[PDB]
Enzyme design. Structure first.
Site, mmCIF file in Angstrom:
data_model
loop_
_atom_site.group_PDB
_atom_site.id
_atom_site.type_symbol
_atom_site.label_atom_id
_atom_site.label_comp_id
_atom_site.label_asym_id
_atom_site.label_seq_id
_atom_site.Cartn_x
_atom_site.Cartn_y
_atom_site.Cartn_z
ATOM 1 N N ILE A 21 -1.444 26.000 18.565
ATOM 2 C CA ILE A 21 -0.459 25.716 17.256
ATOM 3 C C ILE A 21 -0.144 27.042 16.517
ATOM 4 O O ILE A 21 1.008 27.591 16.526
ATOM 5 C CB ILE A 21 -1.072 24.699 16.368
ATOM 6 C CG1 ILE A 21 -1.200 23.393 17.034
ATOM 7 C CG2 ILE A 21 -0.367 24.636 15.064
ATOM 8 C CD1 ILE A 21 -1.509 22.067 15.985
ATOM 9 N N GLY A 22 -1.168 27.809 16.269
ATOM 10 C CA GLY A 22 -1.166 28.865 15.316
ATOM 11 C C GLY A 22 -2.237 29.871 15.291
ATOM 12 O O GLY A 22 -3.231 29.668 16.193
ATOM 13 N N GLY A 24 -4.827 31.014 12.307
ATOM 14 C CA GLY A 24 -5.420 30.838 11.108
ATOM 15 C C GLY A 24 -5.996 32.022 10.692
ATOM 16 O O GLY A 24 -5.676 33.178 11.263
ATOM 17 N N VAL A 29 -5.886 27.974 15.968
ATOM 18 C CA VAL A 29 -5.600 26.281 15.571
ATOM 19 C C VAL A 29 -5.163 25.701 16.728
ATOM 20 O O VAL A 29 -3.962 26.266 17.363
ATOM 21 C CB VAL A 29 -4.746 26.243 14.502
ATOM 22 C CG1 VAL A 29 -4.830 24.843 13.800
ATOM 23 C CG2 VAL A 29 -5.093 27.474 13.270
ATOM 24 N N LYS A 44 -9.328 23.754 13.934
ATOM 25 C CA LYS A 44 -9.261 24.963 13.442
ATOM 26 C C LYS A 44 -10.660 25.723 14.273
ATOM 27 O O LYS A 44 -11.754 25.170 13.712
ATOM 28 C CB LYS A 44 -9.326 25.378 12.190
ATOM 29 C CG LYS A 44 -7.963 25.031 11.403
ATOM 30 C CD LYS A 44 -8.227 25.841 9.978
ATOM 31 C CE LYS A 44 -8.851 24.819 9.046
ATOM 32 N NZ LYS A 44 -9.245 25.235 7.478
ATOM 33 N N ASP A 139 -4.740 29.452 -4.687
ATOM 34 C CA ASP A 139 -3.999 29.978 -3.662
ATOM 35 C C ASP A 139 -2.850 29.071 -3.175
ATOM 36 O O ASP A 139 -2.716 29.090 -2.189
ATOM 37 C CB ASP A 139 -4.618 30.689 -2.436
ATOM 38 C CG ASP A 139 -4.265 31.635 -1.594
ATOM 39 O OD1 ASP A 139 -3.116 32.225 -1.883
ATOM 40 O OD2 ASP A 139 -4.321 31.748 -0.490
#
Ligand SMILES: Nc1ncnc2c1ncn2[C@@H]1O[C@H](COP(=O)(O)OP(=O)(O)NP(=O)(O)O)[C@@H](O)[C@H]1O
Ligand SMILES: [Mg+2]
Length: 343
Positions: A21-22, A24, A29, A44, A139
């Site tokens: 997915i990406g 982190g 992930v 994750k 955040d």
């Protein structure tokens, strides 16, 4: 065994069919078929035991994710790690699988007012729970707001979170700060350590503005330019607001600046629902004491299709953690926190 664009992403018998997915923070992930519940999920991988600072951020996020139970806050369904401290190199956090996040969404899609109103409701509803537990997120920004295909919104990433502490909020002018620059309240550059609730509301206002035009409203390129952006739009603080700033250096910095007037919201967002702008105004109030609180926002007219306090739950009790002890003790503690998920 199973690898996914090296890395090793070994999450044992229960979870298969890994798809990337990406990237982190300090890990990767993936999505993955969950063979017990028979749905796809997200996972994750987190590898923080080397640098002491990632260990606090992992401990924090783990404590909070397991204490909080809420439809608009991401959960931990599972947490995967070795059966011993010695063998534990990484940690995996299994959550519900969300299609996208709001950051990715705002690059390609313009939103309708119906969608903005709905997403804002969900953010504020989840924030209500968080604040009710006496916690601050610290955040909030579009990449920390996850979305699925049915428009359900879930706040994530409590790495920077803290227990509220309003009595110890004062600090000196230009005190360095960690959270994401664009969604930083002005008092952070003046005199705040970010230990009060009104820090999160400013960020939510920043998100509303961004949802309304697909572009950050205060994109400062560096620490102090953030403030000039804010002041470009709100204009010069009134004397009463300047009198709430007792900090001399911050006050004189503000007095040294030329006078600017307020750019009105509908000049900045001519298409927007004017009830949306009214609440925007209240979220992005310069003086933190006058800025609107989370409950008042939920009860604003812009959100009256959804507002229903009895369907806007709060936490069973306050939160209290910790911070400053070394790598190894934090590894023990992350080990201890995650025991329940073992067999
Ligand atoms: N439950 C989830 N479903 C789908 N994608 C997710 C989920 N949780 C996190 N993501 C990721 O969110 C990423 C956005 O970048 P990033 O700012 O690093 O956020 P993050 O992966 O949540 N880690 P952090 O940096 O600690 O917020 C995407 O690359 C996704 O991989
Ligand atoms: Mg981030």
């Amino acid at each position: 065994a199973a690898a996914a664009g090296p890395q090793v992403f070994d999450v044992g018998p229960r979870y298969t069919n890994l798809s990337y997915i990406g990237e982190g923070a300090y890990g990767m992930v993936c999505s993955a078929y969950d063979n017990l519940n028979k749905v796809r999920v997200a996972i994750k991988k987190i590898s923080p035991f080397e640098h002491q600072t990632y260990c606090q951020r992992t401990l924090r996020e783990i404590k909070i994710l397991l204490r909080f139970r809420h439809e608009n806050i991401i959960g931990a369904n599972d947490i995967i790690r070795a059966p011993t401290i010695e063998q534990m190199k990484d940690v995996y956090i299994v959550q519900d699988l969300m299609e996208t996040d709001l950051y990715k969404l705002l690059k390609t899609q313009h939103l309708s007012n119906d969608h903005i109103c709905y997403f804002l409701y969900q953010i504020l509803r989840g924030l209500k729970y968080i604040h009710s537990a006496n916690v601050l997120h610290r955040d909030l920004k579009p990449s920390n707001l996850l979305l699925n295909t049915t428009c359900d919104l879930k706040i994530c990433d409590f790495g920077l979170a803290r227990v509220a502490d309003p009595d110890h909020d004062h600090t000196g002018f230009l005190t360095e700060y960690v959270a994401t620059r664009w969604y930083r309240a002005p008092e952070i550059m003046l005199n705040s350590k970010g230990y009060t609730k009104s820090i999160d509301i400013w960020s939510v206002g920043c998100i509303l503005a961004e949802m309304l035009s697909n572009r950050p409203i205060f994109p400062g390129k560096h620490y102090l330019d953030q403030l000039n952006h804010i002041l470009g739009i709100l204009g010069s603080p009134s004397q009463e607001d300047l009198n709430c700033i007792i900090n001399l250096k911050a006050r004189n910095y503000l007095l040294s600046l030329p006078h600017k007037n307020k750019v009105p919201w509908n000049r900045l967002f001519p298409n927007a629902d004017s009830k949306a702008l009214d609440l925007l105004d209240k979220m992005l109030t310069f003086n933190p004491h006058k800025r609107i609180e989370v409950e008042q926002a939920l009860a604003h007219p812009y959100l009256e299709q959804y507002y229903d306090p009895s369907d806007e739950p709060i936490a069973e009790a306050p939160f209290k953690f910790l911070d400053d002890l070394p790598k190894e003790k934090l590894k023990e503690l992350i080990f201890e926190e995650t025991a329940r998920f073992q067999p």
